[PDB]
Amino acid sequence: MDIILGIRVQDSVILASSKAVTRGISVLKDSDDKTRQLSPHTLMSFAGEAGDTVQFAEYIQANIQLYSIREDYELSPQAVSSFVRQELAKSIRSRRPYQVNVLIGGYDKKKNKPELYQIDYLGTKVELPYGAHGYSGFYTFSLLDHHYRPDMTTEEGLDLLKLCVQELEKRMPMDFKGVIVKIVDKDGIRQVDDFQAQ
Amino acid sequence: MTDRYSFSLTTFSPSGKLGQIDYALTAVKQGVTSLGIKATNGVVIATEKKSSSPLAMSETLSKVSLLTPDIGAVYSGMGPDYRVLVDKSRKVAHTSYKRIYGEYPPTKLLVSEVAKIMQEATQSGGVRPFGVSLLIAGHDEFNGFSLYQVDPSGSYFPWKATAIGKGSVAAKTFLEKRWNDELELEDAIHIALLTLKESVEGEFNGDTIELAIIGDENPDLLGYTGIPTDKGPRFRKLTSQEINDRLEAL
Amino acid sequence: FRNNYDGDTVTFSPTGRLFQVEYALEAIKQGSVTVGLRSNTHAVLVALKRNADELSSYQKKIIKCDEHMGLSLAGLAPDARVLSNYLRQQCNYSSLVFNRKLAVERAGHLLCDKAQKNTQSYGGRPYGVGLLIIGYDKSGAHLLEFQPSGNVTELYGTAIGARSQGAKTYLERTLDTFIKIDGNPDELIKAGVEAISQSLRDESLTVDNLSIAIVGKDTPFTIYDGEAVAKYI
Amino acid sequence: GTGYDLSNSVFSPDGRNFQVEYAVKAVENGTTSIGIKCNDGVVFAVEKLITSKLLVPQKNVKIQVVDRHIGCVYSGLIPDGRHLVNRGREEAASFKKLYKTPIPIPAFADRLGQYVQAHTLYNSVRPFGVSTIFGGVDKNGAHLYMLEPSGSYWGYKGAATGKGRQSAKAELEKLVDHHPEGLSAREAVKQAAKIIYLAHEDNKEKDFELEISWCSLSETNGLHKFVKGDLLQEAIDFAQKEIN
Amino acid sequence: GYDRALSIFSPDGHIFQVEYALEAVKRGTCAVGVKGKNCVVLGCERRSTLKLQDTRITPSKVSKIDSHVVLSFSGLNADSRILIEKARVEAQSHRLTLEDPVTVEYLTRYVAGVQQRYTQSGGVRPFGVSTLIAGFDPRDDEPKLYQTEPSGIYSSWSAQTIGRNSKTVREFLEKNYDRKEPPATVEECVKLTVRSLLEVVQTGAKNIEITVVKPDSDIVALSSEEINQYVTQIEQEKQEQ
Amino acid sequence: GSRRYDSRTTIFSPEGRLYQVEYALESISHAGTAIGIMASDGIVLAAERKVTSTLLEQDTSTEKLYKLNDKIAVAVAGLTADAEILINTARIHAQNYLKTYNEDIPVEILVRRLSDIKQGYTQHGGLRPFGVSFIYAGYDDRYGYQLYTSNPSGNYTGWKAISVGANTSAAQTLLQMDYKDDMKVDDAIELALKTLSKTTDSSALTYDRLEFATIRKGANDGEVYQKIFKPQEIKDILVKTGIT
Amino acid sequence: DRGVSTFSPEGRLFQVEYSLEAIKLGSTAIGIATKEGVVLGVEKRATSPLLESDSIEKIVEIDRHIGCAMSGLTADARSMIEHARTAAVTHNLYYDEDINVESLTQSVCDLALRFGEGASGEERLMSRPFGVALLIAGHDADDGYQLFHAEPSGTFYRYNAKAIGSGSEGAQAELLNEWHSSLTLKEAELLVLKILKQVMEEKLDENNAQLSCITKQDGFKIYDNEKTAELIKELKEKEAAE
Amino acid sequence: AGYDRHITIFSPEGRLYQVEYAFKATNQTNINSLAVRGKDCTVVISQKKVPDKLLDPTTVSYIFCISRTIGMVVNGPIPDARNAALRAKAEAAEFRYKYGYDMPCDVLAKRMANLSQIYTQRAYMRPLGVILTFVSVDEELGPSIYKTDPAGYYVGYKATATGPKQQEITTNLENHFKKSKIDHINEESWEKVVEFAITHMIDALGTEFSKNDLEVGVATKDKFFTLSAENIEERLVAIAEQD
Amino acid sequence: QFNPYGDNGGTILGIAGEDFAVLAGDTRNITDYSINSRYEPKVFDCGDNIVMSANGFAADGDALVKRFKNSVKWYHFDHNDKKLSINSAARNIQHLLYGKRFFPYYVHTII
Secondary structure, X not given: OOOEEEEEOOOEEEEEEEOOEEEXXXXXXXXXXXXXXXXXXXXXXXXXOHHHHHHHHHHHHXXXXXXXXXXXXXXXXXXXXXXXXXXXXXXXXXXXXXXXXXXXXXXXXXXXEEEEEEEXXXXXXXXXXXXXXXXXHHHHHHHHHHHOOOOOOHXXXXXXXXXXXXXXXXXXXXXXXXXXXXXXXXXXXXXXXXXXXX | OOOOOOOEOOOEOOOOOEHHHHHHHHHXXXXXXXXXXXXXXXXXXXEEOOOOOOOEOHHHOOOOEEEEOOEEEEEEEOHHHHHHXXXXXXXXXXXHHXXXXXXXXXXXXXXXXXXXXXXXXXXXXXXXOOOEEEEEEEEEOOOEEEEEEEOOOOOEEEEOEEEEOOOHHHHHHHHHHHOOOOOOHHHHHHHHHHHHHOOOOOOOOOOOEEEEEEOOOOHHHOOOOOOOOOOOOOEEEOOHHHHHHHHHOO | OHHHOOOOOOOOOOOOOOHHXXXXXXXXXXXXXXXXXXXXXXXXXXXXXXXXXXXXXXXXXXXXXXOOEEEEEEEOHHHHHHHHHHHXXXXXXXXXXXXXOOOHHHHHHHXXXXXXHOOOEOOOOOOOEEEEEEEEEOOEEXXXXXXXXXXXXXXXXXXXXXXXXXXXXXXXXXXXXXXXXXXXXXXXXXXXXXXXXXXXXXXXXXXXXXXXXXXXXXXXXXXXXXXXXXXXX | OOOOOOOOOOOOOOOOOHHHHHHHHHHHXXXXXXXXXXXXXXXXXXXXXXXXXXXXXXXXXXXXXXXXXXEEEEEEOHHHHHHHHHHHHHHHHHHHHHHOXXXXXXXXXXXXXXXXXXXXXXXXXXXXXXXXXXXXXXXXXXXXXXXXOOOXXXXXXXXXXXXXXXXXXXXXXXXXXXXXXXXXXXXXXXXXXXXXXXXXXXXXXXXXXXXXXXXXXXXXXXXXXXXXXXXXXXXXXXHHXXXX | OOOXXXXXXXXXXXXXXXXHHHHHHHOOOOEEEEEOOOOEEEEEEOOOOOOOEOOOOOOOOOEEEEOOEEEEEEEOHHXXXXXXXXXXXXXXXXXXXXXXXXXXXXXXXXXXXXXXXXXXXXXXXXXXXXXXXXXXXXXXXXXXXXXXXXXXXXXXXXXXXXXXXXXXXXXXXXXXXXXXXXXXXXXXXXXXXXXXXXHHHOOOHHHEEEEEEEOOXXXXXXXXXXXXXXXXXXXXXXXXX | OOHHHOOOXXXXXXXXXXXXXXXXXXXXXOOOOEEXXXXXXXXXXXXXXXXXXXXXXXXXXXXXXXXXXXXXXXXXXEOHHHHHHHHHHXXXXXXXHHHHHOOOOOHHHHHHHHHHHXXXXXXXXXXXXXXXXXXXXXXXXXXXXXXXXXXXXXOEEEEOXXXXXXXXXXXHHHHHHHOOOOOOHHXXXXXXXXXXXXXXXXXXXXXXXXXXXXXXXXXXXOOOEEEEOOHHHHHHHHHHOOOO | OOXXXXXXXXXXXXXXXXXXXXXXXXXXXXXXXXXOEEEEEEEOOOOOOOEOHHXXXXXXXXXXXXXXXXXXXXXXXXXXXXXXXXXXXXXXXXXXXXXXXXXXXXXXXXXXXXXXXXXXOOOOOEOOOOOEEEEEEEEEOOXXXXXXXXXXXXXXXXXXXXXXXXXXXXXXXHHHHHOOOXXXXXXXXXXXXXXXXXXXXXXXXXXXXXXXXXXXXXXXXXXXXXXXXHHHHHHHHHHOOO | OOOOOOOOOOOOOOOOHHHHHHHHHOOOOOOOEEEEEOOOEEEEEEOOOOOOOOEOXXXXXXXXXXXXXXXXXXXXXXXXXXXXXXXXXXXXXXXXXXXXXOOOHHHHXXXXXXXXXXXXXXXXXXXXXXXXXXXXXXXXOEEEEEEEOOOOOEEEEOEEEEOOOHHHHHHHHHHHHHHHOOOOOOOOOXXXXXXXXXXXXXXXXXOOOXXXXXXXXXXXXXXXXXXXXXXXXXXXXXXXXXX | OOOOOOOOOOOEEEEXXXXXXXXXXXXXXXXXXXXXXXXXXXXXXXXXXXXXXXXXXXXXXXXXXXXXXXXXXXXHHHOOOOOOOHHHHHHHHHHHHHOOOOOOOOEEEEO
């Protein structure tokens, strides 16, 4: 599958997501952004079935943006992840379920704390210090279980990610064409345009 | 064909009154008197069996109905409306409660359901409000004994004792002179029989009077034995005889 | 009286009348005249087309329903469109499912039944148009008169519309004559064009003002307008 | 107060449904038609007013068949009459489909009865502007019926309705009294032609065309058939001769 | 199942329920809008029949349909909510399928259509609301101001007002707004807006709210002070004469 | 048809007013008065039970104050039965919100929803509006203590202090006179009682004719608490405030 | 009250009749058809000088070969236009050709009587008739240039020239005298511009009036103000020449 | 203001005129009926009046067989009478199907009474201008008589009567029971009970009956049937030899 | 299990000249190894100078032709007897065919 990583440090949440988009025998694109911004302080990465992926992401995005305007307020990352789970849990028992796995990373401006939520297509949600979907976790969880600390800086977090990405690039069968990293903190969402060699 | 009456028949008048509700209450006023008294260990509801012909058999016509084994009802107004209300009430008790919690609903709750049924007949399209006022007496483990009254508007209030229909005003008064928070069940059965005598003109006996109570459990009325926790219905209808025996000490 | 019973079609008057239907019948008479007549080989329709300004066209009044059936209208144009279109399907259905051309008499029963439904239920409204149906089927030439009341009658000839009474008398007089105009189309049309002019008064039938249709033994239902009718004026 | 006659399902203070009563007025206003129950069948006849010469003779048939054994004729709003027959035909089809046997006349009668009666329960429909005489032969005998707009109907020895319903009824009663043992199929046909001519007096201004049909166990094999040609002319004469 | 035709034609060719809907607007509080050369301002008067409110939570007169468009109204408040919601939903849906936020003309045309739909659908009455929709098309800097009414008709204005006394305040604007030279400043544009509301609000610092919308989703509401400051400077222009 | 009996509950008056809404308001104006006073540390809900009797059970009673959420409650003025219908759907909206977002429903979102439902009966359906006016008292972590009001029209607004039902004109004036932004819950509890006491149409303002409630944030905790005073608690506080 | 689709004793549909009265109150619109194309013009008629006149859309395109003008309750035309445009596009998708101006018109007219509280004939859900009239003008290979008047009654007529709106009976009278089977497009433009000027309350200029045409060559185009401003000037001069 | 008399909604007095007027319609046929209970049977009597000589006297009836055990006589126009009979037959059939036993007389009555109550509350349904008397020999209650009206009201009877001259029949029957002191007809054969019915019917109406002026229905254990002109004539003779 | 399709064989050929066009097809109709008819026309004149053949599963070919012929009929009714150009007939047939995209007419059609 694609690569969906997420690590929550001291004052932010970092999301790393593969750029490759392969269909069968060809890599159609090597600069894909598998992420959507749900609100100024909430970012969502996703991976899964071809069409369902972007469709579901954009659908959720539309709803949270509608809520924002109606209420002139921004939902907490927790509220958002609960809304996202409920949606997946509906789809799971429908005629044609969305086969999408997501990572919701956001900075709760009310508690002033970063948060990372992992939700699979069945509607299985769990909050963690770090998470991943698919085979990614199989190589990365041991590295994070080892080098992860709750007080890490955004800078240490990026190094720790780089470590994971290198491991993925050594043992994984697929050439996922590197990742796109984004940081969510008290100042919104920003992208690390220089990870191709950081 | 097809009910083209999708609009309300009960609406607000410039003064703020809801005509049909008023008129329905007027219908209740013309109705035979019925009452309910609450004691410390039971409740009693009673009414007059106004026979509409000597050839008719007044037993085949009950004004006092069991809703659940611990809840009974009585009314004043239009008998047919009451009848169908009772069927619906018994049914909603199951579908909205027993079938979900495995136990009969507490009195206030069933009353609330009944009141809902009536409220809807006040606003839904193409219908008239029910032309009755009910008095529901029941008992449940966490609320004890209670007595309620439901009006055509769908409103309901809890009473210590009250009367509805024809001589309601005269009887509501008499009850205020004879009620205290220490009455035993038998006492209220007495107070009841007296209050009802002033309302009845002719024959006043066990065949012209219908009276039931919510009291202790009746294991002899359960029909089976073997389940310790099932002790019997608290609702009991007094027999023609049980009444006459008490009428002597009237 | 009437005022209290003409609110809709579902109401009967104390005398047993259906005023809304009667009012629809009135929209017919206020319509332009059209005539119908048939021999034993052909059936013809002649109609006077009405216009608005001298800058407007002359609203058609003849509709083809199938290769062997068609009609002329008098009253609300829309209602004739709805009815003719319904007739077009019934004809089409008979062809596709039974590979059978629809009997003119049956097209009439169909129309009658469709009309009747709008005179017994609330909300609807009677059709405000009269129709003249002609056709050639397994039983020869045919002419039918359709009234929104739901009444359909088979005739040898007839007319509807304003002053329609003139032509109707002429035909009732010319009967023995035209009914034997077999094998000669040109003549049956002339008989019709003389019956029609028996209801003129305002003007005289011109080229872009006259409309004629015919069907029969070996003639598919065809309509004639403009120069094509010139030889009959 | 008043206004009780403006809506269909409304009861007037006297327990009547005026709108149904007004439908009757539309029936009394129509042509006269009749039914004569005979010893092994029934005969139906109707007056067909000739508006003008332009009407194609013998082409605007009014009598209708239901299934293969039932005949229906009616006075009043013709379109309503058809609507009622259409329903009758479905009602019959449905019965035969489920029960195999063709629908008994009595049963068919009630089907029409309930449908007509139904149109007097709601103010969103108009009562039927027709009275109907129908009947035929079934498992056990012949049956003649007449159905009023109110939905009311009964079995009859003979029946009539329309403009000249009284003249007709007068003639029918004589028949019943003067033929206690029963009338014959052949007889009833002529007799019917006569009653129609007589009852035509109450409309003797416009010329008319006669129409007969019959259903007889012996004469038509229990099947409804129209009377045409010789048998028809024979009855026309029998009447034309007795009207003088 | 209720489909009674409530909006129908009368002998003179009028649809009385739409007309009566307009009377509901006449009774609504006043609302004005004026477009500058680089902005648009919406002003709305606040009733005083009852004062002791909580302004923090009480629903304000101006609403954001999207980050770049706002909408004000005059008429029945409850009705305006139904319209605001639909407009907001459509705003997001348009972004989702067109991948571009709505233009002001588009949003206006949608709101108008909804209003019109309710003037010829059985079982419903027209909206007793008239609206002013303003903002800036995506990536565009030319201000847009539009008005819609119960009938479903809409059009753009250099400046416009609706509500009670809109008649008066429109007069002011007609002889105070030079298309030739529009309020080339956010400041003088707000001034012109307060000036017109004063012709009818009769001393109401707390009875005049104002919102300023600039290009690229730059919308902000002024506070009492900032407004009362304009009120102050304007009453001087009068006495200084 | 039926059109004859359609009152047309959702149409405008030539003046642009909604007949039924206006009449429904007129109805409300005769219901027991209810006051809502918002303090810096809590909210007070006071209502006067319209009509009572010695026999009326006041312990098992609740005809004006209802708990919607754990942080929201309402004061009812008008048709109790109508009120319950609304209250129940409001209680459901609260839970759906919680199940969806795992957070309690912000006060205004719950109020707007209920108001939208009322608004609906104003524009379509041909049904009469709800003869109910609510005073909402609740707390959320965005605006803290809030107080709202909604009537039959579907319109709603926020207040510092407000009243619904009878004598609101008199009541609003008194509140507007002694209310002060810095007030404390207990101060409001007294303002609430004094105000009712002066507008009551009854002789005296006894406990048996009142319902009382407060939504405080009991400092000794850190959470929000809803207290619905019991008869005895009202009798006490009614004596403390000097009304004995 | 009384059924919305009820007949008057004279055999007319009440609602449709009143419908027309509403159209009589609308802004004037005129159409002239020549063998060089069809021209459509309308009276903008802004209700206040603050209303930006060019946001008044009373002339719209249906397809490249069909355009139209409205008069009366203009808001009621929106969905009729939508229906029209769809019909045009749809017809092209199914048959790979252009919809005939007459067919397009017939389709629009079909919507006309689809009103009532429950008329037994289909599912006509619409509470009342439309309160607007339309002048549909286009071109097709079979019948060349055409002008149609579509009313709320459901009927439509083909006109060589036609005016609808407040100044209709007046302008129609004029058109009766001015129109001849050999007018040129230039003549028609002026002729519309001229008769509009006569029936409008305001002094017609390139701001309270708008022109447009449909020619087999460039299709339907709406004349921008500059182009119209000159045609107005050119007219003022030919009139001042006698 | 004046329409509270056209549909079933309350009048200021709290009444329902349409229901009262529907009651008026029940006497429209000017017929009288009465039911009495035997020892182990139930007998119904109803005047039969065939005015038209053209009618087939055999198709003129107001007595109906609803089930193998229930009989129903109607007082009101025949069209509503048949609407009621059909619905009752259907209701009876379905009940047997779903619950496994014959629908009791009183239960069918309650059901029909409930159906009628609905026309009393819902505006689009009109009440039926009829009064239905149901009779049977129930397997649990024995001889039974239950009657329902347009108000949705119903009750069991020791005996009953319906029609224009209903009051004379009732007081007549009342007086007879005040005498016998029992709530029924102490007779083993239904033939005699049928005779008592015809007898006391005559005494109260003050009219003699020929075999075609009556219509008789009898309900016995497991069966309800109607008599023929001849079975009646035989009954008429027996009474003739006592007076 | 029921198979809704069959193969009646046959073959059709179409060649367009400069001012004419031909559309031929054998007249043999079969089922498996049997012959159902030695003469069952498979190429039709549908009016407006259009010949058409839908070869493959006869029942499907028939339904399509039938539907298209009816198409032409209504084209005339709805558009003032206008003649259906062949390119228009082609686009129309595409919609007739795609209409059953998920339960195809088992035919190769030529016009």
